[PDB]
């Protein structure tokens, strides 16, 4: 079991090899896939802003 | 009221056809109405 | 972002009509015990069989 | 309860199964002679079940001298005295109540029962029958 | 037909003194429970091997073993020592006491039975009362009647004198007497059949002449209801006043036990006296150890705990989205002890195994043959997993975790034929389609899989939201045709197009005329629908349909025909 | 809701189906038993 | 008032219990619609015929075959009533669901759901019989439920050849 | 709230057995699609047929 910190927690069900996984405009596949779904009805919109930041930060080498 | 017969209790709803010998309709009943609450 | 790692049943199967399924997850001890502990109270529990082809009545063993 | 779960199969059953008089005079008879708890309740509510099946059943006979003998075991009397006054127009009558002084007499019993409640009209009547 | 006629019965009653003592034949006589020193069952304690059989199956109290009646030296029966479970004792009462279900559990039994209010009748258990004349049958010189809260005077001392000690006690408790024994002898003594015309005839009255008439209206029916079912039974009123108390199989005792030394140590302190006391003492022990809570202020121990009577007594999932609907996976792990019977079983059968010994240790030690058996003996046999409760058909999977599909922790192993025909026959997951509530489906495509269809299933964009300008597209000759394109990436999965439609017009759609007709002065005519063209003519039979639709709505109608098309195929 | 008035709630019963006149009928009436009118209201 | 002998009680009884019927039906399906749940009526006309089902013999009428005050059934007090004059007056009574179900056939029943002391005081009293035909009965003695799987019980011419 | 109603729910009528093919009885349920006084709802009486 994972979880963020906006109450978003999942089980892991799937682990896949690094080249079946989506994959980024700079090549790099991502890590984790999390469900869309889980967002609107729980209302947890935090997550979304904490993700893109984290994004920014870690390019960025900021915290 | 200890029992009832395939014609007072009709179709059934999980099957199609009229309700055979030996269902548990009460309890049926019993969970068709506690189950949405 | 950041993830973390974490550290009627009865009723169903009567409704099903599965009775041969309902008495293997049964099983009597809970029966015979209960009887015992009705005596501790002066009174007693026997189960009978009438036999509907001579209607003999059969004590069990209980 | 043996003869109950058979006229059961009966009555709620197909047509060909359907209880007739001599159907319901078995089923009568095993609540009159029960060997223990009160059954007055039971034959009162099989006899109006053949009273709402009067458009296929009749009694006859023993229908009346089973009820006789009911309802005087258990001092319902003036129930029993309605049953006599049927039982006297059929042939017989009075010899089939007495069952041949088996099952403790119900001839007598109807007798004793009228005298021991003073409704000394209604056994003079029943002396005109025997 | 003919019902197959079933007629099983179970009845309680009342127990006579007599049943009580049948049972255990016996008597606890002792309050003691284990010696301090030996560790073993005291001799005529609680858990005394006379009474109620060996600790150990075919070991005596001396130690002598047989293989599986009584011990010379000891007397315990060579039986096994499962008969602790089920083997009475019981105690002797050296003075009778009311059974408290039928005295003070409102309405009082006893109280509606004899006709004396309860207040009336609890003194003559619990306090120092006494109730003159208890009896009737037999012969009385004394004009006492009733209860008495005092003692009588003359009775200490004049009577007992005049007619000396001994020759007193034969009559004495036929005056006078006193505790719940003073109960049984009214209730031995009482004619059940005096009490219905007594009942009757005073209710009669009542009725010819407000909310006590009422009141003793109802006690009169209860009292003549009461004594009508003693006499067509075979439960003697007596019965309610205990003089053996029955004693628990030590099994079912391992407060209780406590509650049995109480009501021994005050009878064995009464014998030892032969007063009214003492007799109080053990009549409150035995109304403590059958029913608590019905005095006031329960019994308590040291550590502030209410005593508990017999009356207490008897009162992880992963999601699989390829599994199929009646599937599921079981880790080998869970699989392994489920099926062990049945792995234990193929490998005898095969010969992999000499015996159930040797079957064990292949299980033990991960040995590879026992996975392809556990393989075999897993298919075909359906496992309950807790519409809570369905029946799937297990697979093995790689991993620790079980695997259910995307529409829906216990395991049980149906073991008995008859147990598996009805998993696989009533309780798995396709006959089980709708609900019984109102007949609906119970299996919908939810969530990701509706979102999907819904994308699917959105056709292409309309009017100012598909061309900038004000107006003032592929022809596909099958479906198969636009999908290849659709593959190549030539059109895109909302891109309007035209099918050429080869089958009668079963397309939903607004009932609309044409919004053009097109009508060639040769005889032919274009029919143009909102959604469909349709090619006739005057001179010919021809009528041709070309579908404007997306390979999208293409895809949802190929998806269900193919698989109406494939099951029909394998079935 | 039937009728609180007595009357009509007889009629009701008739118009709905729940009692009618054919089902009013004694052991006496169904069994043949005319000498029974003799012995009562007398 | 307006009606004799087993008519004022019989066709009253049948008034007051179909409005009963009517109404309780309607007052469970209102609360149901308004949330929108849909539950065919089958499954609450089973419940509430258990509600409906007893009438109560009047505190006048006394006799040998019934006590004032018993609870008896419906289709057994309109049977009396066709067959005998012996005082049975009776009134409909609307039993909610638990005194209905500490009123059965089965003292098994009642016992393992409330109040089991005074169940078992009551019915040991007058030697009471359990004949075992619902189905938690034979749940705790452990048996096969009468119903689906359980219900209705689940040399001559030798050494006589030719010689030859 | 909802498990305590489901048990009563199911005591109450857990011995209701379908045991025959007929009872053989003669009363029926009128039901009427016409009430003078208001209009039905049509699906919902469809449902109830």
């Given at each position: 079991?994972?979880?963020?910190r906006?109450?978003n927690?999942g089980?892991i069900?799937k ?12 090549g ?9 779904l889980?967002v609107?009805?729980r209302m947890?919109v ?5 993700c ?5 930060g870690?390019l960025?080498d900021?915290? | 009221?200890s029992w ?6 009709g179709?059934?709803p999980?099957?199609g ?5 030996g269902?548990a309709?009460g309890?049926?009943?019993?969970q068709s109405?506690g189950?949405?609450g | 972002p950041?993830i973390?790692?974490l550290i009627?049943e009865?009723?169903?199967l009567?409704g099903?009509?599965?009775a041969?399924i309902l ?5 009597p001890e809970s ?6 502990e009705?005596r501790?109270?002066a009174?007693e529990?026997n189960?009978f069989l009438?036999?509907?082809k ?6 069990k063993?209980? | 309860?043996?003869?109950y779960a058979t006229?059961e199969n ?5 047509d060909?199964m359907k ?5 319901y005079?078995?089923?009568?008879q095993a609540?009159?002679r029960?060997?223990?708890y ?9 006899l109006?079940?053949?009273?709402e099946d ?5 009694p006859?006979?023993?229908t009346h001298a089973?009820l006789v003998?009911?309802?005087?075991k258990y001092?319902?009397?003036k129930?029993?005295?309605r049953?006599?006054?049927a039982?006297?127009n059929?042939e017989?009558?009075?010899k089939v109540?007495?069952?041949a002084?088996?099952f403790?007499?119900?001839?007598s019993?109807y007798?004793?029962?009228?005298c021991?409640?003073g ?5 003079i ?6 | 037909m ?7 019965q ?5 127990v006579s003194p ?7 034949t016996?008597?606890v006589?002792?309050p ?5 020193k030996?560790?073993?069952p ?5 858990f005394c091997e006379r009474?109620?059989?060996?600790i ?9 073993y047989?293989?599986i009646?009584?011990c010379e030296?000891?007397?315990v029966?060579?039986?096994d020592?499962?008969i602790?479970?089920?083997?009475m004792?019981?105690?002797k009462?050296t003075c009778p006491v009311?059974?408290?279900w ?9 109280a509606?039975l004899?006709?004396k ?9 619990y306090?120092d009362?006494?109730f ?8 009385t010189?004394l004009?006492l009647r ?7 005077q003359?009775?200490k ?5 005049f007619f000396?000690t001994?020759?007193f006690?034969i009559?004495?408790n036929?005056e006078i007497?006193t505790?719940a ?7 031995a ?7 219905i015309?007594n009942s009757?005839?005073?209710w009669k009255?009542?009725?010819?002449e407000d909310r006590?008439?009422v009141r003793?209206?109802?006690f009169?029916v209860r009292?003549?209801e ?5 006499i067509?039974?075979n ?5 309610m006043?205990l003089?053996l108390?029955?004693?628990?199989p030590?099994?079912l ?8 030394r ?5 009878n064995n ?5 032969l007063?009214?006391?003492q007799?109080k003492?053990?009549q409150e ?6 029913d608590n809570?019905?005095r006031?202020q329960?019994?308590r121990?040291?550590?502030?705990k209410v005593y508990?009577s017999?009356?207490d007594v008897?009162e992880v999932?992963?999601v699989?989205?390829s599994?199929?609907l009646?599937?599921c996976?079981?880790p080998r792990?869970?699989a392994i ?6 792995v234990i079983?193929?490998?005898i059968?095969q010969?992999l195994?000499?015996n159930?010994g040797?079957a064990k240790s292949?299980?033990r ?9 556990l393989?075999?003996?897993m298919q075909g ?7 809570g409760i369905?029946?799937?058909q297990?697979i093995?999977?790689?991993?620790r975790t079980?695997c259910?599909?995307?529409?829906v922790?216990?395991?049980h192993?149906?073991l008995?034929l008859?147990?598996?025909?009805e ?8 006959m089980?389609l709708?609900?019984?509530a109102?007949g609906?489906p ?10 999907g269809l819904?994308?699917?299933t ?8 598909a061309?900038?300008y004000?107006?003032?597209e592929?022809?596909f ?14 059109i ?9 439609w080869q089958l009668?017009?079963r397309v939903?759609?607004?009932k609309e005329?044409?919004?053009?007709v097109?009508?060639e002065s040769?005889?032919?005519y274009?029919?143009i629908y ?5 090619v006739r ?5 021809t ?11 293409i895809?949802f ?5 193919e698989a109406?098309q494939?099951?029909?195929?394998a079935c | 809701w039937?009728?609180?008035?007595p009357f009509?709630?007889f ?12 089902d009013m ?8 038993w005319?000498?029974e009118k003799?012995?009562?209201?007398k | ?5 087993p008519?004022?009680?019989?066709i009253?009884?049948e008034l007051?219990?179909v409005q009963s ?9 209102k609360?149901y619609?308004s ?5 065919h009526?089958?499954h609450?006309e089973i419940?509430?015929r258990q509600?409906t ?5 009047s505190?006048?009428g006394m006799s040998?075959?019934?006590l004032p005050?018993?609870?008896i059934?419906?289709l057994r007090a309109?049977r ?5 004059e012996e005082?049975i ?7 909610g ?6 009123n059965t056939?089965s003292?098994?029943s009642?016992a393992?759901?409330?109040e ?5 005081a009551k019915?040991a009293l007058?030697g009471?019989?359990?004949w ?5 009965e034979?749940?705790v003695?452990?048996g096969?439920?009468?119903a689906g799987?359980?219900?209705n019980?689940?040399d ?5 050849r030719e010689?030859? | ?7 009563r729910?199911?005591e109450?009528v857990?011995?209701i057995?379908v045991?025959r093919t007929?009872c053989?009885?003669?009363?029926g349920?009128?039901v ?6 208001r ?6 009486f469809?449902?109830?047929?």
């Open positions: 079991k994972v979880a963020g906006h109450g927690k089980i069900s682990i896949l090899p690094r080249q079946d996984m989506p994959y980024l405009q700079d790099r596949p991502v890590d984790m896939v999390f469900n869309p889980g609107p009805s947890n935090g997550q979304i802003f904490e893109s930041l984290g994004l920014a870690s960025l900021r915290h | 009221t009832i017969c395939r014609l007072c209790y179709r059934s999980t099957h056809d009229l309700v055979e010998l269902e309709v309890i049926i009943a019993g109405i189950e949405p | 950041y973390l790692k009627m009865v009723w169903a009567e099903f009509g599965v041969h008495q293997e997850m049964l099983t029966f015979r015990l209960l009887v015992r009705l501790s109270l009174l529990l189960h009438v036999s509907e001579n209607f003999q009545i059969n004590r063993e209980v | 309860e043996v003869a006229f009966m009555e709620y059953g197909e060909f209880p007739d008089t001599e159907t005079n078995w089923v009568i609540y009159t029960a060997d223990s009160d059954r007055v309740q039971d034959v009162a509510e099989l109006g079940m053949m009273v009067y458009k296929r059943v009749q006859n006979v023993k089973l003998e009911c309802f005087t001092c319902v009397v129930e029993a005295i049953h006599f006054r039982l006297k059929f017989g009558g009075t109540l007495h069952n002084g088996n403790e007499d119900p001839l019993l007798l004793r029962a009228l021991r409640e409704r000394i009209v209604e056994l009547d029943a002396l005109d029958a025997m | 003919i019902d197959r006629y079933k007629h099983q179970l009845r309680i009653g009342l007599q049943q009580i003592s049948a049972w255990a016996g008597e006589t002792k003691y429970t284990f010696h301090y030996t560790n073993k005291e001799k005529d304690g609680l009474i109620f059989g060996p150990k199956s075919g070991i005596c109290a001396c130690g002598n047989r293989v009646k009584f030296q000891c007397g029966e060579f039986v020592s499962r602790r479970r089920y083997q004792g019981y105690i009462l009311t059974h408290v039928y005295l003070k559990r409102l309405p009082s039994y006893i509606n004899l006709d209010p309860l207040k009336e009748l609890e003194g003559l258990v306090c009362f006494s003159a004349r208890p009896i009737t049958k037999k012969p010189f004009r009733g209860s008495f809260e005092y003692e009588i003359s009775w001392y004049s009577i007992p004198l000396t001994q020759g006690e009559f004495r036929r007497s505790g024994g003073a109960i049984r002898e009214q209730l003594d009482l004619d059940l059949r005096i009490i015309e009757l005839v005073e009255q009542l009725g010819e006590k008439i003793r209206k109802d009169l009292r003549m009461l004594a009508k079912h003693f067509r039974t439960i003697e009123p007596e019965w006043v003089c108390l029955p004693v628990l030590p099994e005792r391992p407060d209780i036990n406590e509650l049995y109480r009501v021994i140590y005050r302190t009464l014998t030892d006296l007063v009214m006391c007799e003492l053990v022990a035995v109304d403590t150890l059958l809570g019905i006031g329960p019994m121990d040291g550590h502030n508990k017999f009356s008897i999932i992963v699989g989205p599994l199929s009646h599937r996976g079981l792990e869970i002890e489920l099926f062990q019977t049945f079983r193929g490998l059968r010969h195994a000499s159930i040797v292949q299980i030690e991960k040995k590879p043959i026992v996975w392809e058996i393989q075999e003996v046999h359906p496992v309950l997993l807790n519409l369905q029946s799937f297990p093995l999977v790689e991993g079980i259910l599909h995307p529409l922790m216990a395991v192993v149906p008995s008859e147990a598996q025909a998993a696989r026959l009533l309780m798995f997951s396709h089980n709708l609900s019984p109102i609906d119970i299996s919908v495509p939810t969530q990701d899989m509706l979102i819904y994308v699917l959105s056709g292409t964009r309309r009017g100012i939201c061309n900038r004000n107006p003032c592929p022809f000759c099958n479906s198969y045709d636009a999908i290849g394109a659709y593959r190549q990436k030539r895109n999965l909302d891109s309007p197009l035209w099918l050429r009668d017009q939903i759609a607004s005329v044409p919004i053009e097109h009508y040769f005889g032919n274009h029919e909102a959604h469909y063209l349709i003519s005057v001179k010919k039979e009528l041709y349909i070309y579908i404007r639709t997306t390979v999208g709505h895809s109608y190929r998806e269900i025909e109406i494939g099951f029909s195929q | 039937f009728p609180e008035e009509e709630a009629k009701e019963m008739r118009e709905r189906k729940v009692f009618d006149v054919s009928y004694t052991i006496a009436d169904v069994w043949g005319t000498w003799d012995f009562k209201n | 008032r307006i009606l004799g002998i008519w004022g009680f019989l009253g009884a007051t219990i019927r009517i109404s309780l039906v309607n007052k469970i399906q609360v619609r949330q929108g749940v849909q539950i009526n089958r609450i419940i509430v509600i089902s007893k009438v109560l013999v505190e006048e040998n075959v019934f005050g018993e609870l059934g419906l309109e009396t009533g066709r067959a005998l005082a007056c009776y009134r409909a009574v609307l039993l669901i638990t005194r209905a179900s500490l056939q003292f098994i009642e393992s759901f409330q089991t002391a005074r169940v078992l019915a007058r009471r019989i359990d075992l035909k619902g189905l938690k034979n749940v003695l452990g096969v439920i009468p799987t359980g219900f019980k689940g001559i011419l030798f050494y006589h010689f030859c | 709230d909802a498990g305590y109603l489901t048990r729910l199911v109450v857990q011995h057995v045991r007929d053989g009885t003669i009363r349920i009128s009427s699609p016409r009430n003078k006084s209009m039905m709802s049509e699906r919902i469809i449902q109830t047929l």
